[PDB]
Design an enzyme around this catalytic site. Sequence first.
Site, PDB file in Angstrom:
ATOM      1  N   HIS A 163       0.851  -1.210   0.000  1.00  0.00           N
ATOM      2  CA  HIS A 163       0.000   0.000   0.000  1.00  0.00           C
ATOM      3  C   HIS A 163       0.877   1.246   0.000  1.00  0.00           C
ATOM      4  O   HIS A 163       0.670   2.170  -0.790  1.00  0.00           O
ATOM      5  CB  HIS A 163      -0.963  -0.002   1.208  1.00  0.00           C
ATOM      6  CG  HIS A 163      -1.749   1.266   1.363  1.00  0.00           C
ATOM      7  ND1 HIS A 163      -3.102   1.359   1.088  1.00  0.00           N
ATOM      8  CD2 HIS A 163      -1.359   2.509   1.752  1.00  0.00           C
ATOM      9  CE1 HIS A 163      -3.509   2.597   1.334  1.00  0.00           C
ATOM     10  NE2 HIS A 163      -2.467   3.316   1.720  1.00  0.00           N
ATOM     11  N   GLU A 164       1.846   1.284   0.908  1.00  0.00           N
ATOM     12  CA  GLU A 164       2.755   2.421   0.979  1.00  0.00           C
ATOM     13  C   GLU A 164       3.661   2.486  -0.236  1.00  0.00           C
ATOM     14  O   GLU A 164       3.973   3.567  -0.693  1.00  0.00           O
ATOM     15  CB  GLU A 164       3.592   2.353   2.247  1.00  0.00           C
ATOM     16  CG  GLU A 164       2.740   2.459   3.535  1.00  0.00           C
ATOM     17  CD  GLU A 164       1.868   3.663   3.539  1.00  0.00           C
ATOM     18  OE1 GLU A 164       0.722   3.543   4.017  1.00  0.00           O
ATOM     19  OE2 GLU A 164       2.298   4.727   3.054  1.00  0.00           O
ATOM     20  N   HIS A 217       1.743   4.284  -2.938  1.00  0.00           N
ATOM     21  CA  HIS A 217       1.805   5.733  -2.799  1.00  0.00           C
ATOM     22  C   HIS A 217       3.171   6.218  -3.319  1.00  0.00           C
ATOM     23  O   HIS A 217       3.259   7.266  -3.944  1.00  0.00           O
ATOM     24  CB  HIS A 217       1.727   6.162  -1.353  1.00  0.00           C
ATOM     25  CG  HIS A 217       0.367   6.113  -0.745  1.00  0.00           C
ATOM     26  ND1 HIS A 217      -0.732   6.743  -1.302  1.00  0.00           N
ATOM     27  CD2 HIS A 217      -0.050   5.579   0.430  1.00  0.00           C
ATOM     28  CE1 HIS A 217      -1.775   6.559  -0.503  1.00  0.00           C
ATOM     29  NE2 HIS A 217      -1.387   5.846   0.548  1.00  0.00           N
ATOM     30  N   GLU A 219      -5.947   8.015  -1.003  1.00  0.00           N
ATOM     31  CA  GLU A 219      -6.103   6.746  -0.262  1.00  0.00           C
ATOM     32  C   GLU A 219      -7.092   5.806  -0.943  1.00  0.00           C
ATOM     33  O   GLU A 219      -6.867   4.594  -1.032  1.00  0.00           O
ATOM     34  CB  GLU A 219      -6.567   7.032   1.168  1.00  0.00           C
ATOM     35  CG  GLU A 219      -5.552   7.783   2.044  1.00  0.00           C
ATOM     36  CD  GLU A 219      -4.264   7.000   2.281  1.00  0.00           C
ATOM     37  OE1 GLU A 219      -4.127   5.831   1.829  1.00  0.00           O
ATOM     38  OE2 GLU A 219      -3.338   7.540   2.914  1.00  0.00           O
TER      39      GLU A 219
HETATM   40  O1  LIG Z   1      -3.091   4.703   4.572  1.00  0.00           O
HETATM   41  C1  LIG Z   1      -2.188   4.847   5.373  1.00  0.00           C
HETATM   42  C2  LIG Z   1      -2.375   4.411   6.777  1.00  0.00           C
HETATM   43  C3  LIG Z   1      -3.476   3.706   7.107  1.00  0.00           C
HETATM   44  C4  LIG Z   1      -3.747   3.143   8.471  1.00  0.00           C
HETATM   45  C5  LIG Z   1      -2.921   3.372   9.577  1.00  0.00           C
HETATM   46  C6  LIG Z   1      -3.224   2.779  10.811  1.00  0.00           C
HETATM   47  C7  LIG Z   1      -4.347   1.963  10.939  1.00  0.00           C
HETATM   48 CL1  LIG Z   1      -4.774   1.190  12.479  1.00  0.00          CL
HETATM   49  C8  LIG Z   1      -5.158   1.720   9.852  1.00  0.00           C
HETATM   50  C9  LIG Z   1      -4.847   2.310   8.650  1.00  0.00           C
HETATM   51 CL2  LIG Z   1      -5.954   1.928   7.327  1.00  0.00          CL
HETATM   52  N1  LIG Z   1      -1.009   5.316   4.953  1.00  0.00           N
HETATM   53  O2  LIG Z   1      -0.796   5.553   3.595  1.00  0.00           O
HETATM   54 ZN   LIG Z   2      -2.410   5.205   2.275  1.00  0.00          ZN
END
Ligand SMILES: O=C(/C=C/c1ccc(Cl)cc1Cl)NO
Ligand SMILES: [Zn+2]
EC number: 3.4.24.69
Length: 402
Positions: free
Chosen positions: A221-222, A225, A248
């Site tokens: 996911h990161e 980005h 997001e």
């Molecule tokens: O989307 C994020 C972070 C998301 C996130 C961070 C911590 C928790 Cl508990 C849940 C989520 Cl979905 N960074 O790009």
């Molecule tokens: Zn994110």
Amino acid sequence: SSGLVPRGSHMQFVNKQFNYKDPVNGVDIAYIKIPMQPVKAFKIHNKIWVIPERDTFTNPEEGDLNPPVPVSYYDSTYLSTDNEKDNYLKGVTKLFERIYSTDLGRMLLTSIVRGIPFWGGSTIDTELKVIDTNCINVIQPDGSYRSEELNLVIIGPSADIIQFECKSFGHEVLNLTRNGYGSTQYIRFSPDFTFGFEESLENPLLGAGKFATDPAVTLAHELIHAGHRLYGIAINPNRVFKEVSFEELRTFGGHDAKFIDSLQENEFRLYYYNKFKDIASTLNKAKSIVGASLQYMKNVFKEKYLLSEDTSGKFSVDKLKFDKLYKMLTEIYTEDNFVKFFKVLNRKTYLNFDKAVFKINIVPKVNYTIYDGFNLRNTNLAANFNGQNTEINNMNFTKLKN
Ligand SMILES: O=C(/C=C/c1ccc(Cl)cc1Cl)NO
Ligand SMILES: [Zn+2]
């Protein structure tokens, strides 16, 4: 024991099986300084370094690890010892190999490695020049140092341990993550914790179960980005539903991304198409370079951006190649698609997570593998995502107090 090479002789993305205690060599283990006392860092791949330290470096306000959103978790003590730093480095390593084990991950990581931040650093309009914050200083064993350009740094979290994010250093004038240029990305990430979500699977008396996010999915996911931001096509974080940002939703993908209307999407695509045309014009107007031939560096960026070149040597954006690259980075590289490839359980929309945080240890192969995650084949954990079920696989998840 650690399970870093399930097939073949050697890891296929990460270049060495590092131990934190391996001596600095100035090549792939070195003390480095970010654009601070030096911190020991490991070059896991061309253009990608890992710093197994809490990030007290990148944001000046966030210099300490004490407590002053739904879920947060603080432990000033996490990642302070060499053993922890060793386990962090091997866990990040394992997650990279897990991502690279998939066709989708190989496409994404390639794009990332190829996505060198643009040399748009001159105040002279006809001169190409690096932007200083897209580098690190790599100290050698004898204490000399060289500046090295890089694309990505994986670093430990700041005070809030579960606050994973992809950030980067700004320019006083340029919006590097939104003008096509790109910038070196720093991912605050821990492989040692994860967060929960609830899911109801399908005998009849099974209510909702409590599952843990697979940390390969979080890191991907990161990394997604990072891809957007390295090609400078991130969506402005002021674009939100209210709260969840467009950026997001795009990155989570699946049905979440369909809430960005196609008219809006066409508008962003055109915006960034024009930003890429601006980069091709700049390269064309370039007459000199400071700090490699001009011809060589121009070509590096023709390669990054899939630019077309005529017999004059003049560059132009090809509309079909632009669409391909843009669609790859924004539509194909998504959390949802990694979930499908990993065949793991994940929450079904970006906000639908628990306020549950868990300590995990992914490094032992008896806990987590590159091919199966927590859902180890030929065990009770292969069925019904039982390895991610925090009740059934309780030995792998210690619930932390929020
Ligand atoms: O989307 C994020 C972070 C998301 C996130 C961070 C911590 C928790 Cl508990 C849940 C989520 Cl979905 N960074 O790009
Ligand atoms: Zn994110």
